[PDB]
Amino acid sequence: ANEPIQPIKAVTPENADMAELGKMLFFDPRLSKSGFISCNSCHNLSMGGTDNITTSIGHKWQQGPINAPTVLNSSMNLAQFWDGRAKDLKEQAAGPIANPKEMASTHEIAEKVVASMPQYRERFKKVFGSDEVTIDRITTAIAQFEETLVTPGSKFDKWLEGDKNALNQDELEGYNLFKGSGCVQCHNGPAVGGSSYQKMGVFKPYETKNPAAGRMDVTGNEADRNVFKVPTLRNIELTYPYFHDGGAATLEQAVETMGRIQLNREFNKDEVSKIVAFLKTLTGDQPDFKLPILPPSNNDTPRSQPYE
Amino acid sequence: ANEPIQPIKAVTPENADMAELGKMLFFDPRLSKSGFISCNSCHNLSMGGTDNITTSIGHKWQQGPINAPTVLNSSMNLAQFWDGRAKDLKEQAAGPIANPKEMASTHEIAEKVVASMPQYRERFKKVFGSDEVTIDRITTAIAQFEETLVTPGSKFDKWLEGDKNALNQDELEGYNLFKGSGCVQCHNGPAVGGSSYQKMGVFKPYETKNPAAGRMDVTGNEADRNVFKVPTLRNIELTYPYFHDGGAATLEQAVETMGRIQLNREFNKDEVSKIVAFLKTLTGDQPDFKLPILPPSNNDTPRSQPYE
């Protein structure tokens, strides 16, 4: 009778220097064509790792196609992106940099930008052995930093570890309903999700104008239409709005929809209130580190093109 | 012992908690209508306090009218903004929040946004005795945070304080050229500028397509046309491009232009490189603090409007 959910464990970077280099790159807006957009712009670590809007604002204020997921605990995902088209964090990181709808630069340009700065070259030398800058090393460093973005210490985890007073009566009943109703069928493990692909709209379809088809984009099979990676519910309190289209503005709405179309279960108001209370106890310790200080661009650095 | 420039000294917040609150607000993108733009977006503290582009990107990617100045050491300015229309940091902070070309929100909405969060209400109470949030308290807190954004410790300051080795041969000669040519007429004091309004184009006009008129926008006196607050040269190495229109991409170009139109001095390539070397020794210790962790928006919080 072991719990369907396990505590998140603290992480010690295999390569501290690499994680520091990755941190810097994650906050460097010069990886973008505009010199205005960094990974942190859309995955704000001061706010829970997302941009907290329906879909992401990209280069020249392009309205993105889908809701940006949190990077927090993303190292635990079975694959990356809503349709899992990316195998891991490293592969994922190369995407946004060259995505015309997001950072809109190119791997070639990103390499030249970083390499133009002596302070970055020195770090690549320390970390990789030589001062050569490549998108491969860049994504490897960012990935290492993201591995450290886990959030242990949530009240629920403290309860799981034996602290009976970490949860109040409503929160405990919420968890019991979460488990008893069937939510754990898909939202389980340390991340309370992120370990499989499931249909969004089991008993009834999810109503949305958003055209995303999920896994079908990868397989082309009709059976995969509307099948997405199950999101982690850790820090769900900080990652509103909800669902891939950002269609559910509140947790209550997300829970009611989930109960209704995934379990054919209409929760009453108090039941929803208790589950939501439980979900908020899944918020863990947020990133704790100094604001990164980045090296200045110099006369050799390709200049930003915010309006060009 | 009587150099025209004096060292910058560390600043301990009169109210530590107030500065901590100001720090959180400075990094909060919810002060903007889009929920995507914070003070840090255009005054990036990881990069030197500016956005490092010709003019600022505002709501819906509006191309701003003028180059964004650095907030670093801004507490030393005789007034705020290129035309000095704002008397101090407190007064200045109210501008961007309600500027349709920048954050595009309103003072009323920002107050409602911040007050909707218990975590913020609690901080305002421990700071101002009361838990109610007003644009007055918001700007007071931000200004307090900005008072701490001074940058002591630059190599030049170490030199002024006794370390004869803090500067190399070229850097020292550069300083001597700076002092001996007439530059300290306008760039002096602890901020190496910021203490007066001066004409941009003393001997010859500064060519630019930018329509900014400077002090005339405030005084209406034709005599004040093209008269601006002299920018601080502290951390000038980190705040490219240069001048109010962002027209000079390099320090070499900026120095050459300044000598020509301000002093009627034509510096040869060697002299320019030495002055540039000196300017870089004005880069001080950058902000050293933990990345702010902000409270989550809740069901009572006005929702971000990035596209509507």
Ligand code: HEC
């Ligand atoms: C907005 C303009 C973005 C920028 C800049 C970056 N990311 Fe992002 N990211 C964004 C979206 C809309 C999505 C989902 C896209 C999809 O097709 O599903 C993502 C996804 C990720 C993920 C996947 C996490 C998951 O649970 O699936 C990761 C790990 C991630 N993003 C990391 C990341 C990094 C490191 C970035 C900078 C190099 C970066 N993103 C920029 C939107 C935006």
Ligand code: HEC
């Ligand atoms: C599989 C059959 C699921 C069951 C059972 C439950 N959930 Fe779920 N959930 C699942 C998926 C595939 C998704 C993403 C759907 C999409 O296209 O957006 C979700 C998402 C949520 C969310 C939002 C997460 C986010 O947007 O980041 C919440 C809050 C959530 N699910 C809660 C939840 C609860 C409380 C459940 C039972 C009542 C439940 N889910 C069951 C897949 C499945």
Ligand code: HEC
């Ligand atoms: C970009 C869209 C901006 C945002 C967001 C904020 N600021 Fe800004 N700031 C910007 C510009 C283009 C200018 C100059 C405007 C002019 O007419 O001169 C400024 C100026 C300041 C200053 C004055 C510094 C000086 O004159 O030397 C300060 C102190 C400053 N800005 C602070 C500040 C704060 C605290 C913000 C958020 C509430 C903020 N700015 C946002 C562009 C942008």
Ligand code: HEC
């Ligand atoms: C007043 C009569 C000045 C003298 C003498 C010098 N400078 Fe200056 N400088 C002055 C102003 C009013 C401005 C802003 C002009 C504008 O409209 O943009 C500046 C700016 C600079 C800068 C750029 C600062 C920035 O963009 O933030 C630099 C690097 C600079 N000045 C250097 C400099 C040097 C080396 C001088 C002597 C050769 C010099 N200035 C003289 C006003 C005055």
Ligand SMILES: [Ca+2]
């Ligand atoms: Ca979300």
Ligand SMILES: [Ca+2]
């Ligand atoms: Ca500048």
Ligand SMILES: [Ca+2]
């Ligand atoms: Ca010039």
Ligand SMILES: [Mg+2]
């Ligand atoms: Mg020009």
